[PDB]
């Protein structure tokens, strides 16, 4: 039994526990069980993996999982999503720096605790449902089958405190005929470290994250698959997940209610530039283990299906040009309690009731 605990502004206290065994019983397969829990999510999985599906090193992996997501505890407009499902994945090493993945998946989603609101109800209508704008207690359940694909490039010089190279991760998903939902979703993440000096003590880091998904035919992508932005890992200085569209609630039993409750969206773009330098005023020998950075972060999340014509007087959440921006300082080092990172950032471009969070940290 391997345990772990962490603490941060993004998810509060995180617990992790798991067991793993390669070459179980001399069969050649690895078997694992692991779980994680934080302020808004409980996740558990069982895994079986053959690292030599072919002699060449193609791996075949299987996953059985359960997940419990509480949207309001993740700083979104409220809902509960209890899910479970399976995945079978083929993994291809291309060379030492590149890997490819292709897999098939099943997922069951059970949605509840949804208050009537424009974007969610719009998705339900696209699914052929006719919920009333005063329905407080509906549940929605779906069974989806997917094709999943991925590509990872990693040529960073080292895992901890990188100074040179790039990492790129592309991940995509599309539903298979027979699913309830019909949609696709693609994500791209990049990070590139460019050292200035031969010593690699001064480094420029550029990061990007892109995301796009949409429904097929008349259907929309499910809102419980939306992208988010804001927080320690995307746009610092903003509360986790606050960036982008906000829920518009229907009157109880009048007019609509604007809120500041983030709902995410089906399109997202985030970029960051930061200047990694030696740490001033520090004692000698601490310097190599303590990394200071000055950053400029920026990001947007938007809703390509927002019908601006129907909601006159409300913000146009389909507009992709409301780019949030912040600047600030970060410090990172290894402590007795594990990896330590914190930042002070000031948002200087905000929109649509985004919530600020200047001081953000993570331990573990």
């Amino acid at each position, epitope marked *: 039994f391997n345990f772990g605990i962490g603490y941060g502004t993004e998810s509060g206290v995180s617990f992790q526990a798991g067991v793993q065994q390669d070459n179980w019983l001399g069969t050649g397969y690895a078997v694992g069980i692991n779980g994680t829990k934080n302020d808004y999510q409980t996740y558990a999985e069982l895994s079986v993996t053959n690292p030599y599906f072919t002699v060449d090193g193609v791996s075949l992996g299987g996953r059985l999982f359960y997940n419990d997501f509480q949207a309001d505890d993740a700083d979104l407009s409220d809902y509960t999503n209890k899910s479970y499902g399976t995945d079978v994945t083929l993994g291809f090493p291309i060379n030492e720096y590149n890997s490819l993945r292709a897999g098939l998946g099943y997922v069951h989603n059970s949605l509840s605790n949804m208050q009537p609101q424009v974007a969610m109800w719009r998705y*339900l209508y696209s*699914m*052929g*449902e*006719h*919920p*009333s704008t005063s*329905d407080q*207690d*509906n*549940s*929605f*359940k*779906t069974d989806d089958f997917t094709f999943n694909y991925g590509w990872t490039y990693n040529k960073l010089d080292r895992g901890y405190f990188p100074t040179d190279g790039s990492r790129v991760n592309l991940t995509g998903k599309v539903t298979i005929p027979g699913s*309830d939902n019909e949609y696709y979703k693609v994500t791209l993440d990049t990070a590139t470290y460019v050292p200035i000096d031969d010593d690699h003590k001064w480094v420029v880091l550029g990061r990007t994250r892109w995301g796009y998904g949409d429904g097929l035919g008349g259907k929309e992508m499910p809102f419980y698959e939306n992208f988010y932005a804001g927080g320690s890992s995307t746009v610092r200085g903003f509360q986790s997940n606050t960036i982008g569209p906000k829920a518009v609630y229907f009157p109880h039993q009048k007019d609509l209610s604007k809120s500041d409750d983030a709902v995410g969206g089906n399109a997202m773009a985030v970029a960051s530039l930061e200047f990694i330098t030696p740490t001033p005023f520090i004692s000698d020998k601490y310097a190599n283990s303590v990394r200071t950075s000055f950053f400029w972060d920026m990001g947007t999340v938007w809703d390509t299906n927002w019908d601006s014509s129907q909601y006159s007087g409300y913000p146009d959440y389909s507009d992709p040009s409301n780019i949030r921006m912040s600047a600030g300082i970060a410090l990172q080092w290894m402590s007795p309690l594990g990896p330590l990172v914190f930042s002070y950032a000031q948002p200087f471009k905000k929109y649509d009731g985004d919530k600020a969070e200047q001081f953000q940290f993570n331990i573990g």
Partner: nanobody
Amino acid sequence: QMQLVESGGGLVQAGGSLTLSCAASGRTFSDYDMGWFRQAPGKAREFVARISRSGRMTSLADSVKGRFTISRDNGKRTVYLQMNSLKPEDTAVYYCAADPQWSRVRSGADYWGQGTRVTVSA
């Protein structure tokens, strides 16, 4: 004219469970939102649960939240009521109902079954 026939009602002990079924005649079952209602002796009929044409959307009365579940099988032209953790207050005749409209089927319907009786003893 579509007919609805409920079955599954019986005598059950408090804490036990039961599954009701409602079978529909004809080939138009998927055209209808479906509902379960119940009527205790001396009282008016009352809403219990409903389910959309597709089977994906459901809702439940407050008195059965967390205990009852509604589902349907459009291939078998059947809607089900799964009743767990039963109490003596659940004793009643249970009726199946069908209506073209989701919002209406919470209070009434175009088509009604003849009911199936459930008795929960303490």
